[PDB]
A and B are shown apart, each in its own frame.
Chain A
Amino acid sequence: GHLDQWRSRQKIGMGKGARCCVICSNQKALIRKYELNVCRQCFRENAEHIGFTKLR
């Protein structure tokens, strides 16, 4: 019955533990705005390529 028990709580897919950065798979400091799903550090690294720019 271990195949059913294995990752059964991750089957539910709810909470901070079910979403990860689409670049680095880290589950901390995620940006959900506009469904970006990028952690803030990776977002700072990749923002120019994504299209954002530092103004104001």
Chain B
Amino acid sequence: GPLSKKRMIIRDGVFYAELFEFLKRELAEEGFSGVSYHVTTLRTEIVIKATKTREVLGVNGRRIRELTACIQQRFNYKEGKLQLYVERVEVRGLSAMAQVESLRFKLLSNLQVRRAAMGIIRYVMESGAKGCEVTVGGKIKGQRAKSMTFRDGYMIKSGTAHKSFVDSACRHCYMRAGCIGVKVKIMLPGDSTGRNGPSEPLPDVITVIEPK
């Protein structure tokens, strides 16, 4: 023989990374926001987080069955050992992956960079975000590439709390003149559950409790 626990952890991580990349490429048009897999002796459970759940399912689950077949053939899962689910994202406006895909789609419609980025930011803040930051860079005005950044609300850049209070996504958007980079970072609000956000207060905030 059996593989060592170190080797098992490495193998599981590599498998998750590859599955994430495959689902990100396959479901780029849909609001692919993540994947979570649970493994038991009975079978392996794979949950897909997406915005357009119907397209990921397809008609009578055709698309989901094709994805299941792809994963089964690539990783040599035996019959009945793999099952794929699709669940929608609770708040679309707080998902950086969904918003970079939305911004990319608006850009591919030959929309102006400022207009599309401002719409993304407005929708993100409308969904109750603490802040938002959209960066678009590349050949926007001519051969001389320039990088534009649009901001709103507040964002944290330093420490390691920005890895838990801010979510980020970046993609290359391909155009006729060349490559365009799109980045979105959303400062998540505070939710006590932890389903969205980190659920603990900010690391530099002290709140004094009102007495009785």
Contact = CB atoms under 8 A, between A and B. Distances in A.
* A contacting B, Cβ–Cβ less than 8 Å: yes
> Which of A22, A35, A36, A49 has most chain B Cβ within 10 Å?
A49
B177 interface: no
B162 to A, nearest CB: 12
B10 A49 contact: no
A23 B17 CA distance: 10
> Which of B6, B16, B17, B21 has most chain A Cβ within 10 Å?
B17
Nearest to B17: A49
B67 to A, nearest CB: 19
Contacts of A15: none
Contact of B10 (A23, A34, A46): A34
Contact of B13 (A22, A23, A51): A51
The dominant DSSP class at the B interface is: helix
Interface string B11-23: 0111011101100
B16 A49 contact: yes
Chain A interface extent, by class: 10 to 19
Contacts of B14: 22, 36, 38, 50
B130 to A, nearest CB: 23
Contact of A50 (B6, B7, B13): B13
Contacts of A46: 17, 21
A19 B136 CA distance: 37
A49 B20 contact: yes
B156 interface: no
Contact of B9 (A23, A38, A51): A51
Contacts of A49: 13, 16-17, 20
B73 to A, nearest CB: 17
Interface string A13-50: 00000000011000000000011101000000010011
Contact of A36 (B10, B12, B16, B18): B10
Nearest to A22: B14
B169 to A, nearest CB: 13
Nearest to B11: A35
Interface of A: 22-23, 34-36, 38, 46, 49-52
Given A23-B21, A49-B20, A51-B10, 10 more contacts: A23-B18, A34-B7, A34-B10, A36-B10, A46-B17, A49-B16, A49-B17, A50-B10, A50-B13, A51-B9
